[PDB]
Amino acid sequence: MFKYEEIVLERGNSGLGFSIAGGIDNPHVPDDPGIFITKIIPGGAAAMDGRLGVNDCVLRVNEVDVSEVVHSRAVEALKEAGPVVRLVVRRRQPPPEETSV
Ligand code: NA
Numbered sequence: 001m002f003k004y005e006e007i008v009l010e011r012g013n014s015g016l017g018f019s020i021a022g023g024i025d026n027p028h029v030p031d032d033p034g035i036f037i038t039k040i041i042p043g044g045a046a047a048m049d050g051r052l053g054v055n056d057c058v059l060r061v062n063e064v065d066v067s068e069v070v071h072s073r074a075v076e077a078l079k080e081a082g083p084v085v086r087l088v089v090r091r092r093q094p095p096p097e098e099t100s101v
Contacts, residue, residue: 004090064077
């Protein structure tokens with residue numbers, strides 16, 4: 001399935017230091033409405049924190065669910081989330097060594 005992670009960033013003078021694509025009206029890939037990271041800015045908060053990666057999917061911004069929203073609503077959430085932004089993200093979970101069935 002997926003690996004989930006909570007990542008907390010402090011906003012800087014140039015924001016959070018990443019770009020997003022995706023949204024119900026802006027799919028990154030077919031039939032996926034998710035918000036995905038497309039760019040991490042050198043010297044920005046995301047880069048300096050080290051945890052976020054390109055093509056991570058952002059599911060939540062503080063208390064705002066962004067799993068299935070229009071692009072502008074995700075941008076809005078990220079803009080208005082305040083000085084400390086808690087991101088719930090997911091990415092690929094590598095196959096396990098074994099699975100109990
Ligand atoms: Na929406």
